[PDB]
Design a protein around this ligand. Structure first.
Ligand SMILES: C[S@+](CC[C@H](N)C(=O)[O-])C[C@H]1O[C@@H](n2cnc3c(N)ncnc32)[C@H](O)[C@@H]1O
Ligand SMILES: C[C@H](CCN)[C@@H](N)C(=O)O
Ligand code: SF4
Length: 337
């Protein structure tokens, strides 16, 4: 009945969030996943959207405590040349993606002269013609406006948490309202916006509710949750979370809270097997799919130690077929834009 109630317009209360978020039993969790699939199937059927991830520069000037690419970490870093971007684009044409996500750290090269980023968006839009999600960090409003004019469609700029006590330990040195304000500015210029929270990073149930309610206030087009994977060389490298607040539970709660929105199943956390679990918890778009071949990186990189990664669209679509799901039509995706 819970899925039916939501389909009809029921708004989950804070008591409902507490109850859903504290579910621990196999049967309870299966009833929560089933409810979220009812809601997702009502609005999306068995059709799934596919987003390619192009991490085009792994340089960052910021010092996030959770992220492998924080500026204090002495690691391998790359910055794709124009020729490498064009070669990557050639491998994506006609592959079946609905959108491409052009992501970078806050790379000083692109921040010193943001016309270099605007030209990168123009080249990719000219090559692919597809909807483009940008994840450039907190770029200034003038650059956001120029990138919109070159064909950027989505801005992904995740808040991580709306619990202020936690945000300042995670996004060290970054304004809390700066990110909120940039998503608002981008919506005014016509972008769709994705917000996101991290779980497994010391958020308890109350912190998670504050973050779910914080995400809803701004009317995002896409909402996500990622499991924190502690990374080598960061301040949080040893962190162990003592919580039941799994990404799958929160995906189902997001579907019940944002029934009509996009919610990702990311390959970056648990790969294709993890994708199955996330789609069965209510997700409707598969992200962190890499270009065919590709030495390109994800962000959490659950598969950093594997001799062979399984991140390509053809493996994703094969697994959706096994699940009884199918890629969506492009026009259905464009309807969200
Ligand atoms: C793809 S965005 C990068 C864009 C730009 N640098 C930024 O911070 O907005 C990185 C996000 O990846 C996720 N992330 C980073 N490190 C992670 C980790 N160790 N585990 C899980 N998610 C992580 C976070 O939600 C952070 O918002
Ligand atoms: C975190 C990344 C996305 C950033 N906008 C990508 N690895 C993902 O999981 O979708
Ligand atoms: S999350 Fe984004 S801003 Fe923070 S260190 Fe990682 S790449 Fe840089």
């Amino acid at each position: 009945s819970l899925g039916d109630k939501v389909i009809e317009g029921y708004q989950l209360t804070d008591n409902d969030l507490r109850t859903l978020l504290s579910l621990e039993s196999k049967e309870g969790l299966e009833r929560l996943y089933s409810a979220a699939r009812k809601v997702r199937d009502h609005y999306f059927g068995n059709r799934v959207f596919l987003n390619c991830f192009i991490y085009f520069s792994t340089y960052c000037k910021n010092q996030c405590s959770f992220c492998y690419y924080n500026c204090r970490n002495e690691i391998n870093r790359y910055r794709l040349t124009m020729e490498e971007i064009k070669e990557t684009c050639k491998t994506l044409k006609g592959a079946g993606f609905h959108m491409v996500d052009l992501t970078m750290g806050e790379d000083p090269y692109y921040y010193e002269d943001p016309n270099r980023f605007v030209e990168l968006v123009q080249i990719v839009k000219e090559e692919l013609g597809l909807p483009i999600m940008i994840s450039p960090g907190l770029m200034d409003n003038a650059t956001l406006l120029k990138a919109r004019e070159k064909g950027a469609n989505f801005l992904a700029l995740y808040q991580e948490t709306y619990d202020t006590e936690l945000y300042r330990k995670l996004r060290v040195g970054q304004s809390f309202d700066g990110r909120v304000n940039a998503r608002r500015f981008a919506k005014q210029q016509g972008y769709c916006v994705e917000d996101g929270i991290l779980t497994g990073v010391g958020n308890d149930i109350e912190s998670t509710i504050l973050s779910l309610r914080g995400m809803s206030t701004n009317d995002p087009d896409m909402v996500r949750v990622m499991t924190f994977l502690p990374q080598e060389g960061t301040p949080l490298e040893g962190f162990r979370d003592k919580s039941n607040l799994s990404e799958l539970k929160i995906i189902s709660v997001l579907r019940l809270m944002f029934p009509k929105r996009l919610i990702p199943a990311s390959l970056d956390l648990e790969g294709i097997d993890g994708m199955v679990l996330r789609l069965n918890a209510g997700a409707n778009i598969v992200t962190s799919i890499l270009p065919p071949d590709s030495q390109l990186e994800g962000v959490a990189n659950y598969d950093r130690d594997l001799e062979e990664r399984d991140r390509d669209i053809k493996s994703v679509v094969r697994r959706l077929e096994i699940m009884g799901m199918k890629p969506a039509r492009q026009a259905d995706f464009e309807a969200v834009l």
